[PDB]
Amino acid sequence: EEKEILWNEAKAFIAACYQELGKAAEVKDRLADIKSEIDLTGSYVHTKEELEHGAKMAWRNSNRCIGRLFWNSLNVIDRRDVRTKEEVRDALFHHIETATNNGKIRPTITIFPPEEKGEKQVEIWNHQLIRYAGYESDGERIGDPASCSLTAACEELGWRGERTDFDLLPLIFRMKGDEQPVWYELPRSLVIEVPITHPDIEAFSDLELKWYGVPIVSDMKLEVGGIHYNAAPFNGWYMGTEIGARNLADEKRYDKLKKVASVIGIAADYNTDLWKDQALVELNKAVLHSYKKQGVSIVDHHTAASQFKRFEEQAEEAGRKLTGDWTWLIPPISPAATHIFHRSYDNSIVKPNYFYQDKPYE
Amino acid sequence: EEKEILWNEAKAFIAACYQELGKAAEVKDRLADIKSEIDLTGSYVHTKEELEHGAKMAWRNSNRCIGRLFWNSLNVIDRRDVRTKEEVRDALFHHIETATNNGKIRPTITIFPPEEKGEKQVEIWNHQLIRYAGYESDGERIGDPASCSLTAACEELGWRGERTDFDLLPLIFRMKGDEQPVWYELPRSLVIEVPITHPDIEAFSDLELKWYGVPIVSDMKLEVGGIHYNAAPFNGWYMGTEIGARNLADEKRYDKLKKVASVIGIAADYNTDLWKDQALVELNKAVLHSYKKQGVSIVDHHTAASQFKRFEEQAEEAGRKLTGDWTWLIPPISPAATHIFHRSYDNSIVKPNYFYQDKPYE
Ligand code: HEM
Ligand code: HEM
Ligand SMILES: Nc1ccc2ccc(CCNCCc3cccc(F)c3)cc2n1
Ligand SMILES: Nc1ccc2ccc(CCNCCc3cccc(F)c3)cc2n1
Ligand SMILES: C[C@H](O)[C@H](O)[C@H]1CNc2nc(N)[nH]c(=O)c2N1
Ligand SMILES: C[C@H](O)[C@H](O)[C@H]1CNc2nc(N)[nH]c(=O)c2N1
Ligand SMILES: [Cl-]
Ligand SMILES: [Cl-]
């Protein structure tokens, strides 16, 4: 009954995958051995080629992603061989190192063993491999409020943060058979951070802002041909707005706009002065400038939008239907200055794809 | 068969309308005389009260409108008595004068005779009562490109613009029975315009930018209880972004960002400089400052969003379901700085409401 669902997703995936790979004739045979493997074993195993391409397709089908133009150059690391938590840790450590690449970020995914009977083999608790802790007790707010629950969960497990605004959370994941996850402190040598400075305004450094170089989302499920890789951390490079317009700007995050307004020497008293808008722009100029000055890869929303237009064109030229989430594709600053704002997108879900899954904590 | 459709929309409207007006007991009687009027005559006539409230409800149900908090103070002018084109013109002239109110803009609607058998009594060709002409021939682009087709249509009818970037289009409308519309030049004395200057940057005036004080949309159909008022021009005051972020900024409109960047003394060479974003902010600061300095009503997107939050609260407190179009409610600058961005809205269409209708020209 579940062999059914698996079989249909499998048929659809192999057909599309081998078609794209120019291996159309191999399909019929490949489906046979798959159908056989399903009957006897309950599931099937992807070849390295299928898995590599599947992850790339998944990125291509991510409606909310503006950076999809480079779907085909995704660096896929196959770690389905891991069995121990030391291996998982070392693989996670390695992902960080190779994705970072001294600042020349390589879009990478590391793929761990998939679910068996819906039973996880590895269960990553981090939202990103690199993320700042968040604390809130009596009156006191420290760090990233988005990290409050995971931070408290880590501190249940014997970890303790220094309670700076930028404590690096430890890696935290659970192996099948264990009741509790384990946690490992990150080697500082592996984690690139960027101090935020401004090209014109020397006072901007007084804010003592910084962010991490590489966003590595690690709580999403990669689905490929009926196979559920619940643990498959992936990364790209940042679009500046993600940091300057949200992470540092949102009132429910770091909430820096009033402070930005002060150091750039404008008043924050009247809405009609548009001080938030002005602060947002200077803060976002600062983020791009800082990353570029350090030699850490990053893209601005305009260039990113230009690239996404190429992606649209490429999709059409290749005879592929385009899907997208307009509400997530438009950047949070000057969205009407991008072509994205002025057209609409079909928000249909196509597989392979990346999905949300329930948090183990909370 | 059409008496049916009319009757159902009527029943629904009267029930809701008299409920809101505290006149619940009058409903049963009101429905009787309505049902009778439908049978014999094919339609029915709204009382001044019903019509006034209906227009207010329509504004309340406008999913795309951020300014809905003040739905209940809409100034409704009942011009269902008009029969001649001189009367229509004078009513349109009067709408402009009273809505403008020396700069202290009053949200107003003027309601003309509704459709009979789907047959229009009056047919307004203008998109707004006050709008700038647009021209494009060989290489030459002049004025508002959004006005190109209507401008060419007016020039078919014997009108001629001076071909400045800000030619006021004449009022153009057609009376039932006439094959062609008529056109009337606007008295300059009735039209307030605002020159765009900047609070800090004196050079900003070199751009010679200006806009009109009052946006009076005149091509939408007001629908109330099955009755189709195809000609019912309405106005509010401007949100600054409408002018500074779209009308003057869009590449397919006035396309001023590169020029703004120059007069404010920044380079327009690199995307990572965010010069468009910076230009957008200074241009939008200029628009708000200029309108306020002239004493012409206007709102910024933050204040407008604050007001719309009150509208949400008011809707809930009154037991009314809220409907909205997220893609139109978010402002085109700093949308993530408003609460609108961070929640979702139900985009259901509720009547009474304002609708698009086909252009008579093109
Ligand atoms: C190469 C540079 C990349 C850039 C600049 C980029 C840009 C973005 C941005 C700005 C978002 C919106 C995130 C937010 O609003 O929080 C996004 C969403 C997303 N991106 Fe990308 N991306 C890149 C690479 C990738 C890669 C390598 C993958 C995976 C293979 C990926 C998959 C996604 C997914 C799944 C989402 C949506 C996540 C969610 O719904 O929460 N992207 N991308
Ligand atoms: C009082 C001040 C008002 C403000 C600041 C305001 C603000 C806005 C804004 C910014 C838009 C988006 C327009 C665009 O993106 O092109 C909008 C749409 C709209 N507003 Fe309002 N509005 C106001 C009053 C009114 C009034 C009096 C009515 C009618 C009774 C109205 C009905 C609408 C409608 C129907 C739309 C959508 C039109 C369309 O879909 O093209 N608004 N409003
Ligand atoms: N630059 C990139 C590259 C790949 C990405 C892949 C996924 C995402 C989504 C990250 N945000 C998800 C929503 C979320 C979840 C948890 C906390 C938050 F603040 C926000 C962002 C990306 N950014
Ligand atoms: N400030 C206000 C008040 C009421 C409004 C009522 C309606 C509208 C919609 C105006 N724009 C409609 C879309 C459109 C149509 C035609 C040309 C364009 F450039 C744009 C704007 C309003 N702005
Ligand atoms: C496709 C998209 O809905 C369309 O381009 C919208 C986007 N949001 C908008 N929002 C406003 N206020 N005005 C507009 O004209 C548009 N255009
Ligand atoms: C309701 C709405 O879809 C939600 O708040 C979205 C809006 N668009 C977004 N766009 C991006 N890129 N990231 C987000 O977190 C959100 N939040
Ligand atoms: Cl992030
Ligand atoms: Cl307008």
Curated annotation (Swiss-Prot), chains A, B:
The record ties this protein, via SUPFAM superfamilies, to: Nitric oxide (NO) synthase oxygenase domain
Q: Which GO terms describe its biological process?
A: nitric oxide biosynthetic process
Q: Which Pfam families does this chain map to?
A: NO_synthase (PF02898)
List residues binding heme.
Answer: 65
Name its co-factor(s). heme; (6R)-L-erythro-5,6,7,8-tetrahydrobiopterin
Q: What is this protein called?
A: Nitric oxide synthase oxygenase
Q: Which family does the entry's similarity section mention?
A: Belongs to the NOS family. Bacterial NOS oxygenase subfamily.
* Statement: the UniProt record of this protein carries the keyword rRNA processing: no
Q: Which keywords belong to this entry?
A: Heme, Iron, Metal-binding, Oxidoreductase
What's the record's note on cofactor binding?
Answer: Tetrahydrobiopterin (H4B). Can also use tetrahydrofolate (THF) in place of tetrahydrobiopterin (H4B) but binds THF with much lower affinity than H4B.
The organism sits in which domain of life? Bacteria
Question: What CDD domains does the record point to?
Answer: NOS_oxygenase_prok
Q: Does the keyword DNA repair apply?
A: no
Q: Which PROSITE patterns match?
A: NOS
Q: Give GO MF terms, alphabetically.
A: heme binding; metal ion binding; nitric-oxide synthase activity
The record makes one more remark, namely: This protein is similar to the oxygenase domain of eukaryotic nitric oxide synthases but lacks the reductase domain which, in eukaryotes, is responsible for transfer of electrons to the ferric heme during nitric oxide synthesis.
Gene expressing this chain: nos
Catalytic activity, reaction form: 3 reduced [flavodoxin] + 2 L-arginine + 4 O2 = 3 oxidized [flavodoxin] + 2 L-citrulline + 2 nitric oxide + 4 H2O + 5 H(+)
Q: How does it assemble?
A: Homodimer.
Instruction: List the InterPro entries hit by this protein, alphabetically.
Output: Nitric_oxide_synthase_Oase-su, NOS, NOS_dom_1, NOS_dom_2, NOS_dom_3, NOS_N, NOS_N_sf
EC numbers on record:
1.14.14.47
